[model samples]
Target: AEPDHPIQLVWTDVNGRLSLDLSGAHDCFLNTRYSNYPVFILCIIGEKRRGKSFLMNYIMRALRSMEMDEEISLGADDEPLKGFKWSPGTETTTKGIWMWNRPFLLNHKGGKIAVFLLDTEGSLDIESDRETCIKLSALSLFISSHLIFNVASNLKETELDYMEMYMNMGEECGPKNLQHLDILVRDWYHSKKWDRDVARSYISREIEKLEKLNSYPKVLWSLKSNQTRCFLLPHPGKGITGESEGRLQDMDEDFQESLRSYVSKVVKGICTHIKTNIDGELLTSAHVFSMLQEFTEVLNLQIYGFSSPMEMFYAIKNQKLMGEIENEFQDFLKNQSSLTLPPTMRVKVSQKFSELLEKFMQFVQGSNTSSHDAMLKDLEVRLLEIQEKFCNDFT
Candidate 1:
């Protein structure tokens, strides 16, 4: 299948600090205007070298059965290992957080639903710092509509610690922003038969203790449990790890069917429970862009510890405003089909850019954010470059 974008660089280093690049990684989604459609953000977070990428590949494969066009295969089936790369060693495959450029479009009873997947840096890995994991987890929890907690065995102490951290952040950022947590147990070879209710009870009890320890209200903790879902998946075969030679198509029929079933259920769940924005309206592509922008800005600040929901909401709204301005400028250029004289194109570009700058400055004045000044400076250079390019095209 064609990737929405070839490069996924949402978070990048500028001046030796990671900064949010709103226009690059998410360009395809923005270009296609999918941001205006209903969106579902799904993320999988877990420990390193635990088949997270492996699971992602299968998830993509499962999504192929959605009865869409045939051109959307993950990759060539002849080369079974062409999908998400994996290895038997301890090296991390995913760095910060990687998102699928294009979303899986599902036509449901409600309407069309766009599902986006995010693969996060593995936790407790040597390559990643502790603070980075916490920040990534917080962002993942904040944005996801469904979070798949991929685990090899049962929940460990460290895993519980991460859950508590997420819960703490969720409470601080408003629990409504939190997504439905799906505890997916992989490689299930335990003695006890997996019971969904039992698993939910066990996980809920653990989260309850953590909640009480952190002194959060019981009502919030209860709300968390009510939104949690549990699942136990069997190991497909003996060699399901990174080095496994068995192809997805070569795997057991039952295994493939189970994967399909999971996708079906998750898609239905997402359609039924569409996430809402601050206005209580169903989220569209614009909401996704705004959220990602706000998260990147807050995380890159390096000054604030954890942003409050109000702070994040304001940031999201401001970024959306900025994006709308940018989009308007581009749309204006798109309407100029015929080439004009260099001087005339320059005048046109200058007028439009000047208008854009006025709108941007107004937004910056109202924002009161430290990054706005820098963003505006960068935007000035960007507009000049675009002006020059448009003039050159006419020449």
Candidate 2:
């Protein structure tokens, strides 16, 4: 609501998908569009084996399926996830930073949703790697329109500790209902740790938190079934974090019964809250247009790499639009000869595209001769105003 903290994010794949584009707002925010273009960056962070890849896999699959038409384009069956290779590691896919092609999810209806997805290096649970991973993840999160945290199903104390760290370290959590604690269970065999006891304890504790508030179906639905296991688990709270880390092997029929009963007991009382829609009843619709605009503008300044207006002017001033117009005119003839033109006359008719390209880049980027920082501040003011003016009426 305040100027300092102008934009707050909401994370929901609902209403199709939302993407922001800020190219028009290039004059503001550091004034250098090309240098300050990456306006919005969505990052997914988690320790290894926590289903980061799986979630992305699901999202990508959803996206591809959405793109294809049963009649026109080859469906999933024809283009079955052929070597869809994206994994978590220290190495980024390209340029030390991995970025998605501005797409998030696709809706059967209109609107093709797309957002920048940045996959940071996974936190290896090692001190150095974990800290560095957290730092990059923090920056990504701060600049993101949304954030997803992945944790193992066993539910490590260390993971929770890090979550707390992020919550505190960040600018502010805002209205972002960053629901869903994405839990990935590796191999899904004996995920409860010391038998099923630990798993039971973790699930129970989370459920207890929500039940105390009288919110049923708090855990929502877990992602599990047919090797698809989000449904295998239960919603632990009105907004509980779920992990698909537990396996059938962790319990015998008896243990399975006990675990199901444990989860069911939580759900039974809370089923009143359960409905076909499982994500959350977050207040979203009202914030859509504004959010998208802000996100797009931010990306325009920082990521897409916009250049300043003034820099462009100087670049244009020295631009060579017609070094030797005759040179270009001579090459314009495809076959038939023009009555042999004189150099001076030819120069009058010819033009060069390079001049425009070069000058445009200069104007887009801003003056190289001036202090970069000073120009950037000017850019920031302009961009900030565009963002600020939008919400002025809200107050």
Candidate 3:
């Protein structure tokens, strides 16, 4: 059978609005060919009608070639490059975000990395009127390990405007040192020939302007230290512009050459950019999976979003868990504060709390390292509140 690796859609459309179907995505991530190896996700997002999906398709072939032994195959030159679905027209083909179901396990420094590709719908599609672009763009930026902010040649203020908004939310939210940002400039015309110097000088000097303005300086500042790089790509030629099919041979030789170089560097560099947490701890596919679960749930709420994607999951848990402890906490106090008073109010409160804490201890029991302790801290804060209130009321 042909490789059963279709780009699975992640966002669930509920009554025409984009939403997260965690259960469906859970199956896609866990049960589907997605393994437990450390994750190195490569996601591309950009303005609609740009070549985001088309470019993603090439990257897929490059990764698939590397899947064999980290070598670039890219299939027959005449091979129709069409996986992430793109077209020459204005209509958006890829809705929400589509992820390759199977991970391309590339060998990296003795260990292997489960590299996945994510292709998101370009911004401001005809159907997307709500905050879909706002939250969806932020979601993509948050989840991916190496995010490619694909934009038309000459990064414009419009694209950077969205980048600032998301980066603002990112700074307010999680992941202090989230790795690797690639700003790939497509269909370039600023440079006569595709020179690396033009891409380098342009991005740096452009960012320098942001240093003085109300523009989100720190966003680019953090990205700068993270070694964010820009790539200038020549136009794909008449094959891409005139025809609808995404074929490699139809592309201009320089465009194909540049694409090959860009895609190769991205795939091979997976080892260098594997994700690390706040303390620089290496995070794997499985942990990243859990993080995404909580992340999507948080995004579904559609607010400026919560701090640290995990907060949504844990906050929800704490609220639910507190309900039980609260009822139990109040029930005991209500019953005890009545008749059959003890000798000392101090002993009465302390003794009851100390004894009640034993039962409340049941509240914090669970697996997963600090999660149980996280709730323990919450319970600790929660317990003291009732204790102080009881002393005041009883006296």
- Candidate 2, residues 72-169, lDDT tens digits: the string is 12123223222123433344331112344233223222432233345544565432333334444444444444445555544455554555444433
lDDT of 1 by residue, 206-323 (tens): 6666565644443245336567676766566554554565476555545544554555566557665665666668888666777766765666556333343565676677678777
- TM-score of the candidate numbered 1? 0.64
Q: Model 1: which ten-residue window has the lowest total lDDT?
A: 5-14
Q: Model 3, stretches more than 4 Å misplaced?
A: 1-3, 7-9, 12-18, 31-34, 170-176, 190-192, 302-395
TM-score of model 2 relative to the true fold?
0.36
Query: Least lDDT summed over 10 consecutive residues: which range in candidate 3?
Result: 169-178
Query: What are the lDDT figures for the candidates, one per model?
Result: 0.64, 0.35, 0.69
Ranking by TM-score: 3, 1, 2
The candidate that wins on TM-score is 3
Model 2 residue runs over 4 Å out of place are 1-43, 49-51, 70-97, 102-105, 108-110, 125-129, 140-147, 174-186, 190-204, 207-395
128 Cα displacement, candidate 1 (Å) = 1.8
Query: Whole-model lDDT, candidate 3?
Result: 0.69
